[PDB]
Design a protein around this ligand. Structure first.
Ligand code: NAP
Ligand code: NAP
Ligand code: NAP
Ligand code: NAP
Ligand code: UIH
Ligand code: UIH
Ligand code: UIH
Ligand code: UIH
Lengths: 251, 251, 249, 251
């Protein structure tokens, strides 16, 4: 029978691309979302129309809180519900905005959001994924290739992305006895943020040595697909950059 | 007059060695502690017996919560109250224990203590240290040379230490325009846990290529006070391992 | 027409599996070898007997010396002569033996270890870039580069050099559309030569399945990096180590 | 009795600054040099005026060749003949010029020079240092903080420096039983070529978060002094960036 995948924040952009490619590949999918209800379901529609009863949505806030453990357990239960199993988890949902260390939301809701989405939620979803368990179980976390050359005033965001690296590695180690492989994919400049002015998008595009453009979500998705495939059966603890060389450029 | 430093989790072991070294090099010191009140006031007595009015204790749970921001603000304030300045902050305090992904603290609490002590409280304390500001201002984060080869089942801890790497870097970037340098010191195996039985202590020592033993607490302190000193005026963002070669030893 | 690939040290073990997989994917191949000439011409038969005229062999010593640049120029040149093109270069060949800080001369140890693992790869890359689709290079790195074997420093030195090439050439060749990346095995394809004790010694260390990578698992990552699914990947090095580099002493 | 150090390319600039400081710390010094005989000797003199019979010079080419092992072995013997002991070795001489991949030394020569100076000579020097020694014995390699963010068209230089990281770690591990520590110091932007236009110099300075200026050679030397000191006695395999945050700045 077909294998099943959760993708968090899958309604749009890189998560959507990841869900769709998983689906094209043969996976059933749980499309998680938080605010983007309509677009989660029009994606479920498009997927179901290709193959019936192979895409469900599932809603949750992944901010850090007393209920996040329960919420994450439910994101996983929702895959066991819909489809009777969970083979793959993709931690993609991510909050991303500035948090200057100096003044010239409150700071703890910033902690909860940035940290929760980017680290703690992936950790709990990792627990829950593992608890339930010729399989090919793997997890893939959306990392950041610029993690060691971070943007100005984004410390919390970066602490979250650093912790996810930490999680990737710890969980790879601890869960390899179970055959649960844990890897990551590190976009650099990919789909630019929607509000960003077009002249700012071009600035960033120009930085990238491979063809002076951002990666398509599709291109990110391909690195994910590879890591979930049987061609990655010996890979765990690896974080593939997909950055066009961006991480290599000195200031 | 004499500079002032805050050392978190300073009552004993490595934090006490830092406090002491900074005091001998001529700093006044805030000795932050959590539960170890006796050892803390005992340390501050010794240090004030050496040099009257140069040491204070300040108490605070560094567990993550919505008041942790004010608790950190107050640690910094305590230093400005007692001494009129704050030149150096050492982020030493840390919670350490297994958090197995697969199986009595709640996980939420496990998250709050492990992330909050090793990453969030430092972020917050950095913000406040920055906010409150001839001078040689620096921060020194106690990190972990094994961060990329972590203990089995210490994933929340390892995510906190990783995030602490991220802060060190992002903060160093963000606060260099203020002349605030931000660096780290990364033990490997130093003073073993108080209640580890000698036999297990030795398994760990035998792994150290340089001497087959652990770093004394002073050996850690030395790296700290180097990084604080004017012999490091241009160092920012560096984390210095003090692991006697252990991170280089493969399995 | 079908793309072409150079694989160094492709007569046997990982290098061979890589030449084979690239052939299955529809590439023509230049099979480089040094001493393993019998194996090398046998491989070429297999592949040519499967698709005619799609494999040649090419002998070279990749030890550092003043004729290396010429040797490396000629390996690339061999691919152009045999196939009219060269889309992919795989730096695989590598010398591997202890060189303690306390057989052969230290100058011969330097020239074999640094040559094979670093200098030939740099030379071959140069020649590859200068003779010019989905063009790219894959360097076989080493997942244990930052946690090495005791006494293997010339070797390690080579591998570190390789990382730097991989990055330096990734960045430099990008405006020419050449991608450069790496695959980094942990403990892989253990010989029958090694003792059961010593083979089990390494196998016990690997978190994922208590075993070494197969030649073909290392090759899989290679072909992923040359494929149209890696078009935005350059500068990247993929560990394929079953968790080994995450294991503390 | 006074300890003794070898410093390669000690005539000028950073290595001289290292020699001076080792000297001012109490070291007798071997000042090695290749073409700068006149400044080598003027330094030997300046130092010997300070303390008689504490500084010699030793000329050699450190390009890779059949005679490099012997030339390196001599350099070490030179310190032994002069001072009766070899305590510290600082590998600092480096060739540095662009070697583009794509269309007037021959490439064989460039290899020999860039890899010999940066990598093979430090290895051969490390062998002989070690061979003689079988206390506070340490080696310090001058590394590069931009080694993973390389300058465009400096592949052979970058390979050199990369191999050097590899030696540091390899040697640290292997020489640890002999009590010999092996560390590195990783300048980012220090002394700019004398002849480089100030307008070109400023483009590098302005990159540097910490004070928008290059490291002085004494700042680099402060890190080396630390590494050789008794404060660094458990420190091996470590590389300390001295870069004012430039390694942290993205494109
Ligand atoms: N874009 C890039 O160039 C880039 C660069 C480096 C790394 N990455 C990483 O690659 C991944 C994908 O990036 P992206 O730009 O596609 O992400 P994105 O557009 O910022 O957001 C991804 C999704 O995360 C979900 N999300 C945000 N906050 C949440 C919360 N509190 N609870 C639950 N879900 C939440 C959102 O879902 P709803 O819309 O359903 O509310 C959103 O659609 C991320 O992990 C990102 O950090 C991306
Ligand atoms: N020891 C090692 O071998 C080693 C290895 C790697 C890294 N490091 C790092 O070096 C630093 C010192 O190590 P160590 O072994 O001396 O640390 P430790 O004794 O395990 O912890 C130091 C102190 O941190 C404080 N702390 C713990 N939980 C807290 C909470 N919720 N709120 C406030 N404070 C809390 C405690 O103070 P009270 O006693 O007053 O409660 C504790 O005494 C740590 O960051 C550690 O991770 C040490
Ligand atoms: N095997 C592992 O576990 C492992 C681990 C980490 C990294 N890697 C890397 O992955 C790659 C493949 O590994 P491997 O174990 O398959 O390699 P291997 O069998 O040790 O060597 C492969 C080939 O390199 C060639 N070679 C050696 N010295 C040479 C010289 N002076 N000139 C030209 N060619 C020479 C030999 O060709 P001939 O037989 O024709 O003489 C040999 O067949 C290597 O770069 C290796 O370092 C492997
Ligand atoms: N300055 C920087 O910004 C920077 C940045 C990153 C790393 N570093 C590293 O820090 C170290 C010192 O840098 P620096 O700028 O002061 O050095 P440098 O001036 O570029 O060169 C140092 C010395 O190396 C010697 N040298 C060159 N080729 C040689 C050969 N074939 N054999 C023997 N010696 C040779 C020269 O000695 P003679 O003059 O006697 O011929 C020269 O004075 C170097 O290893 C460098 O790579 C420096
Ligand atoms: N969830 C999420 N969304 C994003 N949109 C980004 C973006 C993003 C922001 C601006 C332009 C392109 C991508 C990044 C990001 C991280 C480090 C650096 Br250096 C640069 C960008 N992380 C991100 N994470
Ligand atoms: N606050 C704190 N206390 C500690 N006692 C440790 C210890 C510690 C405990 C037992 C034996 C050696 C060290 C560590 C630690 C970090 C990485 C690895 Br791999 C292993 C342990 N972090 C620690 N952090
Ligand atoms: N060209 C080449 N051949 C090899 N056979 C190896 C081997 C190898 C060694 C022992 C058993 C099997 C393969 C490795 C290798 C590198 C780092 C560590 Br830590 C351990 C092994 N590199 C290698 N490179
Ligand atoms: N032996 C040597 N000398 C130098 N003068 C440099 C310089 C240097 C040359 C000009 C301006 C600034 C520094 C560098 C260097 C390292 C990383 C980058 Br990204 C760029 C240059 N390495 C060097 N190595």
């Amino acid at each position: 029978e077909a294998p099943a995948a959760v993708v968090t924040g899958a309604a749009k952009r890189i998560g959507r691309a990841i869900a769709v490619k998983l689906h094209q590949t043969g996976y059933r999918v749980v499309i998680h979302y938080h605010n983007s209800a309509e677009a989660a379901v029009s994606l479920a529609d498009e997927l179901n129309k290709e193959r019936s009863n192979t895409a469900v949505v599932c809603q949750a806030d992944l901010t850090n809180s007393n209920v996040l453990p329960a919420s994450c357990e439910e994101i996983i239960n929702s895959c066991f519900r819909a489809f009777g199993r969970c083979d793959v988890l993709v931690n993609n949902a991510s909050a991303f905005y500035p948090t200057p260390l100096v003044q010239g939301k409150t700071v703890e809701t910033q902690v909860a959001e940035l940290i929760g989405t980017n680290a703690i939620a992936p950790f709990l979803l990792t627990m829950s994924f593992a608890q339930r368990q010729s399989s090919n179980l793997s997890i893939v976390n959306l990392c950041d290739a610029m993690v060691d050359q971070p943007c100005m005033a984004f410390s919390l965001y970066n602490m979250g992305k650093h912790a996810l690296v930490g999680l990737t590695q710890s969980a790879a180690l601890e869960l390899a006895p179970y055959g649960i492989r844990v890897n990551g994919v590190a976009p650099g400049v990919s789909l630019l943020p929607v509000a960003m002015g077009e002249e700012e998008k071009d600035k960033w595009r120009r930085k990238v040595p491979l063809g002076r453009r951002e990666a398509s979500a599709e291109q990110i998705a391909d690195a994910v697909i590879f890591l979930v495939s049987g061609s990655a059966q010996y890979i765990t603890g690896s974080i593939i950059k997909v950055d066009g060389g961006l991480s290599l450029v000195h200031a």
